[PDB]
RNA sequence: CCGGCCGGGAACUCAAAGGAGACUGCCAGUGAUAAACUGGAGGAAGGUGGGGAUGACGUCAAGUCAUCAUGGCCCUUACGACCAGGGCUACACACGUGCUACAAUGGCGCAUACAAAGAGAAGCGACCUCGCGAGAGCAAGCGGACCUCAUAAAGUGCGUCGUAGUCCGGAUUGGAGUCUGCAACUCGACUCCAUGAAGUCGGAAUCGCUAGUAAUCGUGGAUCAGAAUGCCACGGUGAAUAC
């Protein structure tokens, strides 16, 4: 990054609904290279959320990751700045499964669960680090 | 300290290897140690015949050993007694049939075992060690040798601190593989302390 | 009549073998769904067959050993697209377009002395 | 612990221990077989077992006998 | 609910309440259990009590928790009266087997001082 | 029928001793396989490069043994006449095992 | 590496096969399920260094004890010099 | 005899030898019409494809006189030599590097799938019998793409546990053993029964990693009679991110 401007490489897509979005957000959720564990947390996880919202699944999964995307992000000065669409989502999905990670239930597709479905109505842990990102970048608006 | 030994790298490149025996594990070290033995008998008894490689390959329960020299006359002697005599004790020493072969090394300048030995016997004989070093790569320069270093080290003229003071001429490509770089290396035990001689010879690129 | 692809991948190999019939996939002497595909993505083996499709075109004898998982399958897909010669060059044109018969020579990189794997250099203490 | 077949001592413990208990127990034996398992004909005497540096006077009681000699002459000395 | 003392374990499966006498862990359970002719996976609640007194008699046959309290105490008594290298070892509050104290010897010695 | 198995530290060695011996056995006998080739065993050896401390410097040495198998078929007494004391090679091990 | 210490080696090797490999035969076969007397147990005053776990296994040129090579025989010092030289045949440098 | 098991076939995987291949070679654009750069096609690979070996002149009077060699100095009934026992394993402490953890993306039980690379004759040691197990007995085969080490494990499918210092964690300790070895006391390794600490994610600070990478899961080897959580290798799953 010092020289190297970089390519990406591409992800295969979700192998229950095609959903790169959500290949990526079981790759966010997955620990030590397990990642047939991870995508069986997001099927059950969104299954039952899709079940619970009665809209559809990655409708409700793209609902309550569209509450938590960032709009903006900030001698030391901490600068708003625009956040890339790539970097917004990926942002989003890093706050859902931290937040459900730190959540007290049982099973963790079910922290995910009631962590998606408290994104729905936008009440839940991810929400408040959005809101408190957009407070950070909405005190120093005077930095442009 | 740095650098590769020019001989090792190149083993399967261009450079042989001076024992061509096969052998499995239970034999391996003993053959090994056989060639030590071997090596260092018939190094220290050929002191004064200028003795570049001693090849040892061993045919099926038999010692081959080819001294590669510069004064063979020296070697075999008036009707070969000398070289009879070696075979015996090279018998005597590995424990198998031995046969024993000479093969004239013509322009021994070009030699790196050679040169090292004779910078060598230079300066045990006392002399200054730039006429020793800048001679050798002269008279090896003279005939073909598209490059040629040699390097003394270590308290040379009777120091009190030790210096290297290497000289080279033409090209001696060392991180090129296919370069055919004969490389040898002597010591030089003087009323001081070692000399370390070590000599490069580029002969050429393939 | 009978059409061959090589198909390899991360210390894998899958002979794949290709007759038109039905859409049934035979590998090892078993199942597609008993091999492997009570796991991980069994779509991979079926991605080349989406390009255009496999409803009741082709039975597939695919042989595939060494390897992991996900090894063993991504040797199946690049076997059944270097076994469609079956059809002509036209399939690799779009079957290029897909990255399918890019031989993915990805494999691990050995261990280097002083570095407990590949890269991962140990900690250095203080300074 | 060690050995299915036999416990261990050495030929002339096995010696000197007959021997002590022919003549009764006159004097502490010089020990440096601290490999031994203590036999229940050694109960009463007095083996001096070597630690290193020093024999120390070991008097046998009846529950030894399960042990090495050694567990019964410590080699450091700390304070 | 009362077994092998006054240990009162309940509402768990009975491989793993009978863990709770001092002298049983996971094996002998499975010998006592079996023994007694029980399911592994009933709780205590939902037991009859000839099934329980059944758990007494076969429990009544291991050294349990007096016996082996007072066992094990006289096993470090009589190395500690020896005077033995274990019982030396066992007196300083050091560790018996041969382990490293130049570090590292924490749990037989406890938090560490200064 | 008569398996000749051949190993050495050289491949060209090797397969120049075993294309000798695959043309003295089937010019003179007859119903030679051919030289099938049996995997190299590479043996790596990873020493310390350096006279005192300096663990991560090492120095990774290894040794190929080639192998080759014949097994010559037919056995006819000219060619184990003349399969015999025709070798010419120096590192190469043979094993003429029936 | 010290002299005596090479010549120390040579007489572990030289009791070890008097001795041992001939009434090591003892330790294999009578120390059994046969019946028993102490005896054989105790007719280990073979002179402890015919036992062959007392072989150090030196090194061939100079009785280094460390860094031995049973292939070769020689301390990893003596196996790159002499590897580098070209006196061990088929051993070359490796990469892979 | 449903096992490449046999006759057989040499296609295929593969084995190992010999070749082809990738060079900005072609196209478009930008550029001193130059070097080159950016993009495109073809291709298994695209621009030193990935990795390794290869470490310039010298720097640190860096490390090693204990691998070896070596100048000088020094001991030469001793600073040399042989032996037994001990120590290098000590423990108020402090630091480095690792392993195992604190768990439910898990623990345990049952079934079941997919490796690569290696080692082996004073060695690897099947099958079968005995032992809960470490192992023991008889003992084939193999100096080895043939036999043995040797079942890969994470994975998956069921059941259970249910947020507890708990069916987490395994330290520590008692007892009972197996093996190697003259000999396991100081001072081995492993097994079985019992015990069941500390620990609930770590202060200041600090480290590694840019892709088959980190992470995580096993396997092998050298040294070695026996002793690895180290070292050196091998494969399985397999990320995130780079304005």
Redesign the pocket.
């Known amino acids: 990054?010092r020289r190297?401007?970089?390519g990406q490489?591409k992800?295969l897509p979700d192998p229950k609904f095609g959903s790169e979005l959500l290949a990526?957000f079981v790759?966010?959720?997955?620990?030590?290279?397990?990642?047939?564990?991870?995508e069986?947390?997001v099927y059950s996880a969104l299954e039952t959320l899709a079940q619970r919202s009665g809209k559809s699944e990655l409708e409700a999964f793209e609902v309550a990751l569209e509450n938590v995307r960032p709009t903006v992000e900030v001698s030391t000065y901490q600068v708003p700045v625009e956040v890339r669409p790539?970097?917004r989502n990926?942002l989003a999905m890093r706050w859902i499964?931290e937040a459900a990670?730190k959540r007290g239930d049982?099973?963790?597709?079910l922290?995910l669960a009631n962590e998606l479905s408290d994104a729905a109505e936008n009440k839940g842990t991810a929400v408040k680090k959005r809101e408190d990102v957009h407070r950070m970048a909405e005190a120093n608006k005077a930095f442009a | 300290?740095?650098?590769?030994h020019p001989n090792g790298?190149r083993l399967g490149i261009v450079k042989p290897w001076n024992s061509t025996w096969f052998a499995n594990?239970?034999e391996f070290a003993d053959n090994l140690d056989s060639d030590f033995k071997v090596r260092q008998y018939l190094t220290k008894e050929l002191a004064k015949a200028s003795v570049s490689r001693i090849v040892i390959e061993r045919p099926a329960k038999s010692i081959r050993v080819t001294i590669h020299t510069a004064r063979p006359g020296i070697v075999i002697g008036k009707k070969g007694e000398d070289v009879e005599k070696l075979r015996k004790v090279v018998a005597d020493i590995a424990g198998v049939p031995a046969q024993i072969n000479i093969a004239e090394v013509r322009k021994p300048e070009l030699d790196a075992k050679l040169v090292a030995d004779s910078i060598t016997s230079q300066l045990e004989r006392r002399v200054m060690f730039r006429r020793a070093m800048k001679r050798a790569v002269q008279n090896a320069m003279r005939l073909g040798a598209k490059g040629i270093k040699v390097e003394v080290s270590g308290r040379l003229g009777g120091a009190?601190?030790a210096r290297?003071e290497?000289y080279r001429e033409g090209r001696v490509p060392l991180?090129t593989?296919r370069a055919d770089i004969d490389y040898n290396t002597s010591?030089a035990?003087t009323?001081?302390?070692?000399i370390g001689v070590k000599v490069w010879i580029f002969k050429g690129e393939i | 009549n009978q059409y061959?692809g090589?198909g390899?991948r991360?210390?894998?190999?899958a002979?794949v073998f290709i007759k038109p019939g039905n859409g049934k996939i035979v590998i090892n002497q078993r199942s597609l769904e008993q091999?492997?595909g009570?796991?991980?993505?069994r779509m991979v083996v079926r991605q080349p067959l989406e390009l255009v499709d496999m409803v009741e075109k082709l039975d597939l004898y695919i042989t595939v050993?060494?390897?992991?998982?996900?090894?063993?399958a991504g040797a199946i897909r690049h076997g059944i697209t270097r076994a469609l010669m079956e059809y002509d060059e036209s399939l690799?044109?779009e079957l290029?377009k897909a990255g399918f018969?890019?031989?993915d020579?990805?494999?691990?990189?050995?261990?280097?002395?002083?570095?407990?794997?590949?890269?991962?250099?140990?900690?250095?203490?203080?300074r | 612990?060690?050995?299915?077949?036999g416990?261990?001592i050495d030929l002339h413990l096995l010696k000197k221990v007959e021997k002590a208990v022919e003549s009764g127990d006159k004097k502490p034996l010089r020990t440096?077989?601290?490999?031994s398992?203590i036999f229940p004909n050694m109960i009463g005497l007095t083996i001096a077992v070597?630690?290193?540096?020093q024999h120390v006077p070991v008097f046998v009681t009846d529950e030894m006998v399960g042990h090495?000699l050694?567990?019964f002459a410590p080699?450091?000395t700390?304070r | 609910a009362r077994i092998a003392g006054i240990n009162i374990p309940d509402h768990?499966?009975a491989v793993?309440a009978l863990?709770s006498?001092?002298?049983?862990?996971?094996?002998?359970?499975k010998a006592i259990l079996a023994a007694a002719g029980i399911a592994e996976?009933v709780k205590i609640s939902e037991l009859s009590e000839g099934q329980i007194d059944t758990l007494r008699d076969e429990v009544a046959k291991f050294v349990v928790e007096g016996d082996?309290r007072r066992?094990?105490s006289m096993?470090?008594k009589r190395?500690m009266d020896l005077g033995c290298?274990?019982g030396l070892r066992?007196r300083?509050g050091?560790?018996?087997?041969?382990?490293?104290?130049?570090?590292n010897?924490r749990?037989?010695?406890g938090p560490?001082?200064? | 029928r008569i398996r000749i198995?051949l190993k050495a530290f050289d491949?060209?060695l090797i397969?120049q001793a075993t294309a000798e011996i695959v043309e003295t056995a089937k010019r003179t006998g007859a119903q030679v396989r051919g030289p099938?080739?049996?995997?190299?065993?590479?043996?790596?050896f990873?020493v310390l490069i350096?006279?005192?401390?300096n663990?991560?410097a090492?120095?990774?040495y290894e040794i190929?043994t080639?192998?080759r198998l014949v097994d010559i078929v037919e056995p006819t007494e000219k060619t184990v006449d003349a399969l015999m004391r025709l070798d010419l090679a120096a590192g190469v091990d043979v094993?003429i095992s029936l | 590496?010290?002299?005596?210490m090479k010549?120390?080696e040579v007489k572990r090797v030289a009791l070890?096969?008097k001795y041992?490999?001939k009434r090591?035969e003892l330790?294999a076969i009578i120390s059994?399920?046969n019946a028993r007397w102490n005896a054989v147990?105790k007719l280990?005053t073979l002179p402890?260094?015919s036992?062959?776990?007392r072989?150090?296994?030196r090194?061939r040129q100079?009785?280094?004890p460390h860094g031995?090579?049973?292939?070769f025989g020689l301390?990893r010092?003596?196996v790159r010099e002499a590897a580098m030289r070209g006196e061990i045949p088929g051993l070359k440098?490796a990469?892979?």
Not at chain 1, 106 to 109: E, F, G, L, T, V
Not at chain 3, 38 to 41: D, H, I, K, V, Y
Not at chain 5, 94 to 103: A, D, N
Not at chain 7, 1 to 4: G, N
């Open positions: 990054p190297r401007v970089i490489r992800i990526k790759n966010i959720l997955m620990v030590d290279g397990k990642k047939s564990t991870a069986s947390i790539v970097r990926a499964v990670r049982k099973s963790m597709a922290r | 300290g740095q650098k590769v790298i594990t239970k009190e601190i290297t290497w991180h593989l010591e035990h009323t001081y302390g070692v | 061959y090589t390899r991360k210390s894998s190999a002979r091999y492997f009570r796991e991980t993505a050993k060494g390897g992991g998982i996900s090894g063993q690799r044109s290029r018969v890019t031989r020579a990805r494999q691990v990189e050995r261990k280097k002395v002083g570095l407990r794997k590949a890269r991962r250099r140990p900690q250095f203490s203080k | 612990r060690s050995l299915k077949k416990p261990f440096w077989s601290r490999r398992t070597h630690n290193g540096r090495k050694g567990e080699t450091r700390y | 768990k499966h793993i863990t006498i001092y002298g049983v862990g996971k094996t002998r359970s996976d082996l066992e094990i096993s470090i190395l290298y274990r066992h300083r050091l560790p018996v087997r041969g382990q490293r104290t130049k570090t010897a749990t037989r010695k560490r001082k200064p | 198995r491949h060209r397969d099938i080739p049996l995997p190299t065993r590479k043996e790596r990873t350096s006279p005192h401390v663990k991560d090492r120095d990774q190929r080639h192998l094993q | 590496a010290k002299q005596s010549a120390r070890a096969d041992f490999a090591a330790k059994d399920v147990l280990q402890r260094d036992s062959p776990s072989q150090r296994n090194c100079t009785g280094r031995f090579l049973r292939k301390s010092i003596k440098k990469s892979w």
